Paper text:
Artificial metalloenzymes (ArMs) consist of a catalytically-competent cofactor anchored within a protein host. With the aim of gaining better control over second coordination-sphere interactions between a streptavidin host-protein (Sav) and a biotinylated cofactor, we engineered a hydrophobic dimerization domain, borrowed from superoxide dismutase C (SOD), on Sav’s biotin-binding vestibule. The influence of the SOD dimerization domain (DD) on the performance of an asymmetric transfer hydrogenase (ATHase) resulting from anchoring a biotinylated Cp*Ir-cofactor – [Cp*Ir(biot-p-L)Cl] (1-Cl) – within Sav-SOD is reported herein. We show that, depending on the nature of the residue at position Sav S112, the introduction of the SOD DD on the biotin-binding vestibule leads to an inversion of configuration of the reduction product, as well as a fivefold increase in catalytic efficiency.
For simplicity, the amino acid numbering for Sav-SOD was kept the same as for Sav, despite the presence of the 34 amino acids from SOD in the 3,4-loop. The structure was solved with a resolution of 1.8 Å. Residual electron density in the biotin-binding vestibule was apparent from the 2Fo–Fc map and could be modeled with cofactor 1. Further, the iridium was well localized from anomalous dispersion. Unfortunately, the dimerization domain in 1·Sav-SOD S112A could not be fully resolved due to its high flexibility. Given the similar location of the cofactors in the Sav and Sav-SOD ATHases, we propose that the enantioselectivity of 1·Sav-SOD S112A is by-and-large influenced by secondary coordination sphere interactions introduced by the dimerization domain. Single-crystal X-ray diffraction data suggest that the configuration of the cofactor in both systems, 1-H·Sav S112A and 1-H·Sav-SOD S112A, is the same, although both ATHases afford opposite enantiomers of amine 11. QM/MM calculations suggest that the DD forces the substrate PDQ 5 to preferentially present its pro-(S) face to the Ir(R) cofactor in the transition states of 1-H·Sav-SOD S112A, providing a rationale for their opposite enantioselectivity. In particular, 1-Cl·Sav S112A yielded primarily the (R)-11 product (64% ee) in 78% yield, while 1-Cl·Sav-SOD S112A afforded the (S)-11 product (27% ee) in 77% yield.
Author numbering:
A (entry chain DDD), D (entry chain AAA): 13 to 49, 84 to 168
B (entry chain BBB): 13 to 52, 84 to 168
C (entry chain CCC): 13 to 50, 84 to 168
The structure:
């Protein structure tokens, strides 16, 4: 939910994700990757279920980073798709797709798939 | 490209994606799914995303992604899809994507939370 | 679906998949990729399929693996295709695939490509 | 490695994977899922890189389970794609695709994606 999601998250790679959850279901913030790629911060936008189920289910959400800022351009974008799980050890459990710009001939090897787990602690 | 991406796109399922590409790399718009929204404004959902606003010029595609949370003022599927892919320009422009759709689940069902697919968007139905 | 699956398939890249489906649910054969991986370009495949699918019009679930090592080449990687066989006049195998390359722990985050191949019985 | 892979492996769900790696790069064995499931055991076949890199890289591998045996049929197949990393705390790190049989109308929601981590310790 909104209060649970807003703030700073860290994944298993040491990347930092800072996000504000809007009451309208918006996600806005900045992503700092510990791997690949002000110089190493990138805009992110996304959406989340602002009215989740109240049976203990997680909160569905996703966001995108385009790996271009004012300094740098990796001609790629990542989307994270997952769910926020609240409680003392709150997590965002994600699967991600990273697509690099390619010619048609190389499109078959355009997309990386992975999983990040974000916690509020390092 | 910004000029190439802005507009109305249709996928192989018959879903409609309307997007504005900002000079800053923002994607904003609405998504109407032909499937899974109780139909086989009702079926319209906010989307937001990002794209490479300075793509390569060698005929490489333009990397982008966007998200839809499947909640509007009518319905809630307690789920979110993210599309990751590339825009390819030309007479027959395409956005080729792979998508992940995560449903809210208990920790028990988390292993079966996430669908994976692929959508191809064109400017004609 | 055993009769349907057994034979030679081609995907949108021009790759060739020859497979025998066993009555036990085994898939065995050889894969030739038109892309990457440089008989020099044939690789062993093994997999499984549902040998008693639903009769209700649903496809037949199946998957197979190729390790990209033969007697001539080694790309230090393996692809798995997960999908369903759809029968009839224009029979198809609709797949999604994961390709993992061997990596150091440092580079594991970029170890895995994901894609989709459609196989038809004609080029 | 052949000796490194061969044996019994356990994932974070508590599923059990027993596998023999052949000298020819073959993987053969049985899989028991703790979730969704002799009754609860299923044939698996796969391949692995039998001459991996000598640079500290993991060993690429994959395998399939069709969720039919003598007792049960979930009309689906899972493929695991990943790598074996040897040493004191040996792991098989995978991502997986589970396709269910569907009608053409429901093909869009045919395939689940996940990640399992296998260790030799229960």
């Amino acid at each position: 939910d909104q209060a649970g999601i807003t703030g700073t998250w860290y994944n298993q790679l040491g990347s930092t994700f800072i996000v504000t959850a809007g009451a309208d279901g918006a996600l806005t913030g900045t992503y700092e990757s510990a791997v690949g790629a002000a110089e190493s911060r990138y805009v992110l936008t996304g959406r989340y279920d602002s009215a989740p189920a109240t049976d203990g289910s997680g909160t569905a959400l996703g966001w995108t980073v385009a790996w271009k800022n004012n300094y740098r351009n990796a001609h790629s974008a990542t989307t994270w798709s997952g769910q926020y799980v609240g409680g003392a050890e709150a997590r965002i459990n994600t699967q991600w797709l990273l697509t690099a710009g390619t010619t048609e001939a190389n499109a078959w090897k355009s997309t990386l798939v992975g999983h990040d787990t974000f916690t509020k602690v390092k």
